[PDB]
Design a protein around this nucleic acid. Structure first.
Lengths: 123, 37, 591, 166, 134, 229, 37
RNA sequence: AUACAGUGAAACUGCGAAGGCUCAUUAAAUCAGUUAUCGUUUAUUUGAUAGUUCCAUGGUAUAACUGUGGUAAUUCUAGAGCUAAUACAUGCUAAUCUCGACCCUUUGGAAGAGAUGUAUUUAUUAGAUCAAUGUCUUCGGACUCUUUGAUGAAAUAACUUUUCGAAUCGCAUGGCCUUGUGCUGGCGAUGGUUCAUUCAAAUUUCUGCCCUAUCAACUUUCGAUGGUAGGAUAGUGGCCUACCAUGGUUUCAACGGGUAACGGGGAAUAAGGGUUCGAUUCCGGAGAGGGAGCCUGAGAAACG
């Protein structure tokens, strides 16, 4: 689990808890995974709001592309055209998310150009 | 390899300088009989 | 300039030992006075001259801390240090009580002692100066009154000096000259000892070996006095057992049992203290507890008693046979203790222990039937060894059933004390039934049947390996018993163990129904088992949140029926915790 | 440097027709000061009120930390052999954060001989540098922002973690 | 989604629906008197203006109340006066005849659309209209 | 150019007084010029309200604080020396600043919502409020959104009101701004529309945020006196 | 000048005897809250 | 008023100006609200917030000013001579805090041992237990699994060319006898380090009225999409660069097409009858002759 230089390690194995109703799996408390930006050990802290939806693609690593269809009460043509949204998300050592898989994410500390959300739950 | 080696033509340097006709004060025959060996 | 001089100290090592000793010699030549103070004491001293001396002690501390291996030590620096320390003691104990310059010269003296201890902290087994007795007698005549002065949790000037002098090879010459261990043992046997008492005990335990390897007969008598201090300090390591540093006590007690056997009462006190070492704190580890029991056995091999320490060692073996920890190492030490306890009960114990612990053989099942046909009248350690074999130690199942039935036969042939022994059998079977065991739960059910020697058919049909018509007859027996606090708690515990989150079996609804029916039949016994019904509902309520909440919800709903019948009967109680648990159920409702 | 804004570049949707704006003060990219070895010269630049920033260019006196005891002591710099955040950066021998640079470990010899007595429990491939003098150590501090050269020594696991690389 | 503090929905409007025909009927069927002036005191510039309308004397009463209430004369603020005083007096001499404004009868604005025919008590159930009667 | 909370008549002027910086925010406060001059009318213009500020009659939160645009936010007890004027100003039911008159034993204190508890430096527990009174050392059971009671002679917390289900809460923020009644419901969500819900005359229901609500007492016994109609 | 040397030293030792005592005087109130908690 | 003492040209000083015209046409990217920054800057507002001392007061070097001058000439000048500081920059400074062997009983602590900061940038770790109303009462106890609570899942080893431990003032002669300014001795404003708040800014979550498929593909052609590390940052960030993977958006409307985008979007006041006239913030960004580079500040790529 070390394919890059420069002392791949936690930055002070290490373990913390964001709290607020989201579990930390036992390999993510005491396991060999580094958890650089996975918020359970991580360097990031949790805040903001939590969004939920199924996925479209998980092709690249550390990219979870959620879909999010939601109801909105349209008054214009008085029928509901169905919503769709997208958000990239970093991995977690709890679930290899495949197609389907309604999961939720919490807002924190922009990681790439467009990701502020990291997976905290699978159900 | 995106920005790496764009083989394009660029606008301000297309006439940035101008060549010279005679150039080397030697001859090309002087080049050949200079480094035959 | 403090930071500048700290930089000069951090770069004050680049020159050799010659230049370092030369700079230290120039620092010594400020206010040495070796023409005046190398004989006995100083001629004169001033406040600013002691400030040069306090600065000299501070520069000695900084030089030793910088060069904390070699330090460039010299006898001129030693004489200047002794002159400064004696001038500090003389000024502090000869000046009048105004306390300003006296506290200045006292914090000069404590810092000078700290710089003196730094020299032995840096260069201990390097110089070992043969003219030690000059400075030793100077410091002894200074600190004669420091008898119980170093007895605290932080007093570590002369206590650290005594530990340094005791943790050397040949620098104990000033120790064994007149006295070091006398004043150290006075402050050690002081009754207000804080947790530096364990440090002083470990220092004397390490320092008895240098006084034993010393060829001098004075140091031999001092090692005898260190053993006498180990015998006269029989309350310090008892009262100071507040941490897990009991390995120092186990390392001194083995050393004392290997070294000196001086009194039969001393050996009885050592055996009773090492019996309290296993009957005082439950946080004693395996090697420490094994060495403590082996030290009790080593004192018992010399000078044990015949009745009192016999019963004490029998209780030690009756605890260690229920333990048998650390892959039969504690079992082997317990067999040695039972063979050294020297009684008739101990003789039968060593026989019936060696006949079963013969390195994983069939002699265990041979010896169980052997002592069954030849049942011994000791029976305490026999019931301990046959109840450890009736617990979750896989072999001797029918032998465990025969052992429980034979203990019941002896308890019926007594016809009082062996009924209190059956009370201990029931108090062991309760914790056996409230467990995750498989063979030992069935052995405890067989013991319940042997204690029951309709009800016997009910017990043998609950232990019938059928579980459908068996559980139906168990429900019908609960109905007949409906139409017992600990007894019904044990029956419901066995039923909940047979249906304890085993969700690979059907009729779990009827199993929880039988649990709640036995709980209702115990809750009808309001004069006795109302407390047991409250405890069973409380344990089921804890199980309603402890990681699994499917059948525990129906258990809560069906244990509410005791409350419904009680409220219909009432038509006084504790509404407060019931309403708070209703609020907790409303919080679980918002899940 | 130039910038810090998404306006000059494309997002996760692929947009065009940028032509946005004259760049503001708060998109301030300063020049990349590749810190080297020299005589100690730190430029004291200003930002955000009296927020002085120490931009080190020629720092030497690295405070490198003995790992197993945590003893940050003072030494010199030799050169970085491997740093693939730019593989030309080790060709030009600069000094940035998280670089693995070589140190003459003579004060670490002094501290070992001072608080242990003898000279040479510690690993063998760093005992070879205990004997020779040059040990590998990785920079922690930021000379381009805080102006300092602090670091941590290589001791065993992290040593082989870099020695198998290069 | 989420709430957002809207003074335009907890502000007293009361003027989108204030119609002068309804207000005149309420003044007729009011059964409490109306505070009319001593009869000469309400004409304005010796008759060069009108008498004054009911809205104009209400606004004048409000201005004198605020005037005495915090001790300040109002002013000749140019943009607001060139709008309001000149446009107001020109529609006054257009539509106010003898102290009565007849401008409304020349104006398309549906009565029952905005100001009558209740919207909250719309009673869109037979049961709700039955309970609203009984 | 005005907000809604000040109860400011439109026939006043053109430039509206921006409050200066201070304890509360700009959006949740009224300055002293809009307090004294054109609300309870102890002045007629800015010159004479500056004159009485130089005379120093105002004693808001027990200190003088002579300033025109001093942002008196929620329940800062304005104290005026002449005619012993003690004014606690709270929110009414339609968004304005209702300034209730109180007495001396009630103006001897105030209360404040706790925002955060910190282990800041050197082992010191720590508490802030909407006026930012960094007072030393409360108990460990100070959660967020509880209510301290400030001493107003020194600064110490004297009493403490715990935030839980069944407490009398005041809502300052959003479309519920200025309501009282605190019990139909409790609902703590995980990031928004999370609150304790407030009744009405027919006990209707309402939704707000945690930070937009803060406790003032108990179900029938607040030690703050409240105005009525 | 010397009267200012009196007043500076007196205000300094009074500032010490106020602040460094009051700090521990509410740290002991923290100790009371911790003992009661 | 023979070291100062009022008028006061011209000079240093504190601040002033504290927010003004024209030109080419941006479709929630210009804008408005909102979520967050234990992801960050902050002058001013407000609340808080400092313990290292060896054998009676510290140094020349410049003005203004005089004097000699140059040049057609400037808020252009150069020599010579002095002279001051809250300008420059070296440097003078009592003993109090816990554990308490001993207590003489209340006037109780004498001996001993351990103390003592900030500002910068580096690592290990403090950050499972005991108390009953009850398991058995053997009216004693090993008690936590049950019945409830609690401490609880900045201490240290170093750098840095390190800031400081009041050369500010006011009100009050006041107390003491160390035999003279011997100690002054009480309080409040201004200081002074740091935190939080407030103000403002930057990013960032989401929401918000044209017709558009004859715009069906775009994106890697200012990195496209993400990962790792560094640089730069006020910090988050492919913001930029090395290496690596070939991604990402889209028929549930990507991306692209224009104006009554001198008009529109609540951007806002609404008016007691004008029903899209009728109050305003903003059209987009720039510009101080033209692009470029630099500097100042709490805030700037400055109307100066």
């Amino acid at each position: 689990q070390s394919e890059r230089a420069f002392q791949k390690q936690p930055h002070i194995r290490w373990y913390k808890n964001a709290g607020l109703g989201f579990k930390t799996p036992k390999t993510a408390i005491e396991g060999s995974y580094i958890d650089k930006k996975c918020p359970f050990t991580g360097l990031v802290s949790i805040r903001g709001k939590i969004l939920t939806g199924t996925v479209v693609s998980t092709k690249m690593h550390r990219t979870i592309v959620i879909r999010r269809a939601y109801l909105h009460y349209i008054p214009k043509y008085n029928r509901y055209e169905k919503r769709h949204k997208n958000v990239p998300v970093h991995v977690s050592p709890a679930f290899r998310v495949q197609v389907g898989d309604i999961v939720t994410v919490g807002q924190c500390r922009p990681i790439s150009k467009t990701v502020r959300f990291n997976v905290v739950k699978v159900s | 390899k995106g920005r790496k080696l764009n083989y394009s033509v660029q606008d301000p340097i297309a006439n940035y300088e101008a060549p010279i006709t005679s150039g080397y004060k030697w001859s090309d025959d002087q080049i050949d009989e200079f480094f035959a060996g | 300039n403090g930071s500048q001089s700290i930089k000069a100290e951090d770069e004050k090592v680049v020159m050799p030992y010659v230049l370092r000793i030369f700079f230290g010699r120039a620092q010594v030549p400020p206010t040495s006075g070796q023409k005046r103070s190398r004989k006995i004491a100083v001629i004169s001293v001033l406040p600013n001259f002691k400030k040069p001396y306090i600065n000299d002690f501070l520069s000695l501390a900084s030089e030793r801390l910088d060069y904390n291996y070699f330090f460039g030590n010299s006898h001129q620096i030693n004489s200047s240090k002794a002159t400064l320390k004696t001038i500090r003691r003389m000024t502090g104990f000869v000046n009048i009580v105004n306390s300003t310059l006296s506290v200045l010269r006292t914090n000069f003296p404590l810092h000078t002692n700290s710089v003196l201890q730094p020299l032995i902290y840096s260069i201990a087994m390097a110089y070992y100066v043969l003219d030690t007795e000059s400075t030793e007698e100077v410091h002894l005549r200074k600190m004669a009154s420091n008898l119980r002065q170093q007895g605290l949790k932080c007093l570590s000037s002369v206590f650290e000096f005594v530990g340094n002098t005791f943790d050397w090879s040949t620098s104990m010459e000033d120790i064994y000259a007149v006295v070091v261990k006398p004043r150290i043992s006075h402050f050690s046997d002081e009754n207000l000892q804080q947790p530096s008492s364990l440090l002083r005990l470990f220092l004397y335990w390490a320092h008895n070996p240098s006084l034993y390897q010393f060829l001098y007969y004075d140091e031999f008598a001092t090692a005898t006095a260190l053993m006498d201090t180990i015998s006269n300090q029989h309350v310090k390591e008892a009262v100071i057992g507040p941490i897990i540093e009991a390995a120092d006590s186990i390392i001194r007690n083995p050393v004392n049992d290997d070294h000196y056997v001086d009194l039969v009462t001393l050996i009885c006190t050592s055996c009773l203290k090492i019996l309290p070492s296993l009957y005082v704190k439950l946080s004693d580890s395996n090697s420490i507890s094994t060495f403590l029991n082996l030290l009790v056995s080593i004192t018992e091999m010399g000078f044990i008693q015949d009745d009192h320490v016999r019963s004490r060692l029998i209780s030690s073996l009756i605890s260690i046979l229920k333990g048998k920890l650390k892959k039969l190492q504690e079992n082997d030490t317990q067999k040695i203790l039972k063979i050294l306890k020297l009684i008739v009960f101990n003789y039968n114990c060593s026989w019936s222990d060696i006949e079963e612990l013969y390195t994983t053989i069939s002699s265990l099942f041979k010896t169980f039937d052997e002592r069954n046909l030849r049942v011994s009248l000791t029976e305490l350690f026999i019931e301990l060894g046959r109840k450890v074999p009736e617990l979750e130690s896989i072999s001797k199942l029918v032998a465990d059933l025969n052992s429980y039935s034979s203990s019941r036969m002896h308890e019926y042939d007594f016809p009082d004390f062996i009924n209190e022994k059956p009370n201990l059998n029931e108090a062991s079977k309760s914790i056996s039934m409230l467990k995750d065991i498989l063979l030992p739960n069935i052995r405890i059910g067989l013991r319940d049947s042997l204690e029951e020697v309709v009800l016997s058919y009910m017990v043998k049909n609950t232990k019938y390996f059928t579980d459908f018509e068996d559980m139906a007859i168990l429900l019908y027996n609960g109905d007949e018993e409906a139409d017992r606090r600990q007894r019904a708690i044990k029956r419901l515990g066995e039923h909940a163990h047979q249906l304890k989150d085993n969700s690979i079996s059907h009729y779990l609804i009827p199993m929880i129904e039988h649990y709640v029916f036995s709980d209702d039949e115990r809750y009808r016994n309001i004069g006795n088992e109302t407390q047991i019904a409250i405890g069973g509902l409380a344990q089921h309520m804890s199980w309603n949140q402890y990681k699994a909440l499917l059948r525990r919800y129906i258990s809560m709903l069906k244990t509410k029926p005791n409350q419904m019948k009680q409220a219909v009967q009432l038509i006084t109680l504790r509404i407060v915790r019931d309403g708070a648990e209703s609020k907790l159920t409303l919080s679980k409702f918002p899940s | 440097g130039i910038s810090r804004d998404s306006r000059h570049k494309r997002s996760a949707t692929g947009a065009k027709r940028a032509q946005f704006r004259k760049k503001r003060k708060f998109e301030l990219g300063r020049q990349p000061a590749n810190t080297k070895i020299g005589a100690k010269r730190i430029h004291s630049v200003r930002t955000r009120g009296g927020n002085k920033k120490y931009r080190a260019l020629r720092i030497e006196t690295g405070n490198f930390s003995w790992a197993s005891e945590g003893i940050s002591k003072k030494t010199r710099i030799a050169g970085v052999v491997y740093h693939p955040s730019n593989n030309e950066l080790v060709r030009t021998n600069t000094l940035t954060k998280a670089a693995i640079v070589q140190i003459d470990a003579t004060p670490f010899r002094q501290w070992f001989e001072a608080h242990y007595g003898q000279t040479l429990k510690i690993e063998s491939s760093v005992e070879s540098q205990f004997s020779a003098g040059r040990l590998y150590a990785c920079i922690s501090s930021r000379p381009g922002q805080s102006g300092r050269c602090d670091g941590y020594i290589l001791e065993g696991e992290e040593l082989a973690f870099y020695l198998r690389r290069l | 989604f989420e709430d957002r503090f809207d003074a335009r929905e907890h502000k007293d409007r009361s003027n989108k629906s204030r119609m002068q025909a309804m207000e005149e009927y309420i003044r007729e069927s009011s059964d409490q008197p109306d505070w009319s002036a001593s009869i000469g005191a309400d004409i304005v510039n010796h008759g060069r203006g009108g008498i004054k309308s009911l809205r104009d004397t209400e606004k004048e009463r409000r201005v004198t109340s605020f005037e005495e209430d915090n001790f300040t004369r109002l002013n000749i603020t140019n943009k607001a006066e060139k709008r309001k005083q000149k446009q107001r007096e020109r529609n006054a001499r257009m539509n106010v005849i003898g102290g009565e404004d007849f401008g409304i009868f020349s104006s398309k604005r549906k009565l029952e659309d905005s100001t009558s025919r209740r919207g909250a008590k719309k009673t869109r159930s037979a049961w709700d209209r039955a309970q609203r009667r009984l | 150019a005005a907000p809604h909370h000040w109860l400011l008549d439109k026939l006043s002027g053109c430039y509206a007084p921006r409050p200066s910086a201070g304890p509360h925010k700009l959006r949740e406060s009224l300055p002293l010029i809009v307090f004294l001059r054109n609300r309870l009318k102890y002045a007629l213009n800015g010159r004479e309200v500056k004159a009485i500020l130089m005379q120093r009659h105002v004693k808001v939160d027990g200190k003088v604080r002579t300033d025109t645009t001093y942002p008196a936010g929620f329940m800062d007890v304005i104290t005026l020396d002449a005619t012993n004027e003690n004014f606690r100003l709270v929110y009414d039911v339609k968004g304005r600043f209702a300034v209730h008159r109180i007495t001396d034993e009630e103006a001897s204190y105030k209360l404040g919502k706790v925002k955060k508890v910190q282990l800041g430096k050197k082992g010191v527990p720590y508490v802030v409020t909407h006026d930012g009174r960094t007072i030393r050392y409360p108990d460990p059971n100070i959660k967020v959104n509880d209510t301290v009671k400030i001493d107003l002679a020194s600064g110490k917390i004297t009493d403490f009101i715990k935030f839980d289900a069944g407490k009398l809460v005041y809502v300052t923020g959003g479309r519920n701004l200025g309501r009282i009644g605190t019990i139909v419901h409790k609902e703590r969500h995980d990031g928004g529309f999370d609150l304790v819900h407030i009744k009405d005359s027919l006990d209707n229901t309402f939704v707000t945020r945690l930070n937009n609500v803060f406790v003032i007492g108990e179900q029938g016994k607040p030690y703050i006196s409240l105005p009525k109609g | 000048r010397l009267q200012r040397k009196r007043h500076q030293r007196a205000l300094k030792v009074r500032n010490a005897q106020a602040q460094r005592e009051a700090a521990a005087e509410y740290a002991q109130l923290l100790a009371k809250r911790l003992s009661e908690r």
